C-alpha cells in the first residue's frame, strides 16, 4: 500500500447519506428513532442518547459527517483514534498482527464469564469478511461496521 484513491471517500460519503435522508447532515437521536419507527419498533429515548454519547467527542448528540465517520473508523472520545483501535486489537489479541482471530475473541469474552459457542461470533465475521482467512484486520473491522 503506497498510493491512495478516492474510492474510500465515495464509499464513506454514500454510507453516511443512507442514514441522513433529511439532507442537513446530522445523525441525531430523532434520526435514529424515525428509522426504527418506520420498520416497526419504538425505542426508549434515554438509551438512544447513551449509545451515541459513549463515543461522541463533543458529547452533543448531533453527529455530523466527520463525527459519524469518527464513530465508524476512529472511534472513542479521542482525536486520532486509529491508534486507539490498533491498541484495542492488541488487548483482544495475544500477539497483535493487524488482525483479530476467532479464538482470541472467544478468550477475551469468556474471561469475564460467558461460555458461548464460537459459531455465533463466526456468523458475524463472515457477514462481511473481505480477506477470508478467519480473522478481522483494520479495514475489515471498519468496513463490516460500515457495510455499503
Amino acid at each position: 500500500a503506497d498510493q491512495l484513491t478516492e474510492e474510500q471517500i465515495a464509499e464513506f460519503k454514500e454510507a453516511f447519506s443512507l442514514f441522513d435522508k433529511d439532507g442537513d447532515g446530522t445523525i441525531t437521536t430523532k434520526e435514529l428513532g424515525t428509522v426504527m419507527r418506520s420498520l416497526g419498533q419504538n425505542p426508549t429515548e434515554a438509551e438512544l442518547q447513551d449509545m451515541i454519547n459513549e463515543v461522541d467527542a463533543d458529547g452533543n448528540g448531533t453527529i455530523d459527517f466527520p463525527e459519524f465517520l469518527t464513530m465508524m473508523a476512529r472511534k472513542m472520545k479521542d482525536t486520532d483514534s486509529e491508534e486507539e483501535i490498533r491498541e484495542a486489537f492488541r488487548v483482544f489479541d495475544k500477539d497483535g498482527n493487524g488482525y483479530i482471530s476467532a479464538a482470541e475473541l472467544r478468550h477475551v469474552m469468556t474471561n469475564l464469564g460467558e461460555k458461548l459457542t464460537d459459531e455465533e461470533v463466526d456468523e458475524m465475521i463472515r457477514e462481511a469478511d473481505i480477506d477470508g482467512d478467519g480473522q478481522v484486520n483494520y479495514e475489515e473491522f471498519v468496513q463490516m461496521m460500515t457495510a455499503k
Partner: peptide, 28 residues
C-alpha cells in the same frame, strides 16, 4: 431462509446491539 445478507441490515442490527449493551447494564 436468508438468501443473501443486505449491507443496510448488518449496520442496523449492529446499531441495535449498541442499544442492547446499555439496556442490560442500566436495568433499574
Amino acid at each position: 431462509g436468508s438468501h443473501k445478507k443486505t449491507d443496510s441490515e448488518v449496520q442496523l442490527e449492529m446499531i441495535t446491539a449498541w442499544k442492547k449493551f446499555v439496556e442490560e447494564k442500566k436495568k433499574k
